[PDB]
Amino acid sequence: IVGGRRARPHAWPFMVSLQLRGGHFCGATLIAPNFVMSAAHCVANVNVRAVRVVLGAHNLSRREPTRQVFAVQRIFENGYDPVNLLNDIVILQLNGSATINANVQVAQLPAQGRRLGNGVQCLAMGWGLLGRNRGIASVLQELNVTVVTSLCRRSNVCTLVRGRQAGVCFGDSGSPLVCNGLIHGIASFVRGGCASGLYPDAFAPVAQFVNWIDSIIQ
């Protein structure tokens, strides 16, 4: 996240860190005690058997007793297009079930086909790059963004920060877009580089996949 602010500890207890060798590389969302969702391109060309699913994290540089760590058991994708980044969503079944508490919670998703119009106010979040030559963030970041429909495909939800250069960046991919308490997006791609102030950020449209998601997580 470029141009945001520190999230307060465990403000978003559905926020997930996907890690290789103890290293964050993508975000995700807890959508059931034993399932997370993230972007498909995050687990493409990656050894998924080595990926750790980290719940209850806040600071990537500290030892955190609030964490619960799982592994990936099953993978579900529904027509993911690696060229056009269509259907850039993956569901990952965990090798166990999370203990639901104050710091680890299941996100709420919208109804199937639910659409957000221009101007709606949302919150993006993630541990991604803080800016050019600044590296990924230790502390979970959040960013007020606004839904836009210009420069956006009907198969995405797109957002832009008005008035300054801000947006999601490398490392934020897979992270939830939250609008009115519901997860409407999964960070999918940027254009013209991160925080260009010109191209909106693109999210996988979670609402278009709700029936499919439910048929898996029941």
Ligand SMILES: *[C@@H]1O[C@H](CO[C@@H]2O[C@@H](C)[C@@H](O)[C@@H](O)[C@@H]2O)[C@@H](O[C@@H]2O[C@H](CO)[C@@H](O)[C@H](O)[C@H]2NC(C)=O)[C@H](O)[C@H]1NC(C)=O
């Ligand atoms: C910046 O965003 C915060 C947080 O946004 C709301 O909550 C998110 C989780 C998500 O659901 C968004 O779609 C929501 O817009 C805003 O804080 C809200 O602020 C109002 C007062 O203006 C307050 O009554 C609400 O309780 C706040 N909600 C939360 C969860 O804190 C804030 O207003 C936004 N500010 C700007 C300038 O964009």
Ligand SMILES: *[C@@H]1O[C@H](CO)[C@@H](O[C@@H]2O[C@H](CO)[C@@H](O)[C@H](O)[C@H]2NC(C)=O)[C@H](O)[C@H]1NC(C)=O
């Ligand atoms: C689910 O998979 C995780 C991933 O390894 C298991 O977690 C570890 O738990 C063992 C206990 O046997 C510890 O020795 C390791 O240090 C843990 N690893 C990490 C990275 O935390 C977990 O036990 C599995 N749960 C079930 C129910 O199978």
Ligand SMILES: *S(=O)(=O)c1ccccc1S(=O)(=O)F
């Ligand atoms: S991801 O958040 O879409 C992302 C953003 C900015 C640069 C690269 C990436 S990546 O595709 O995950 F690498």
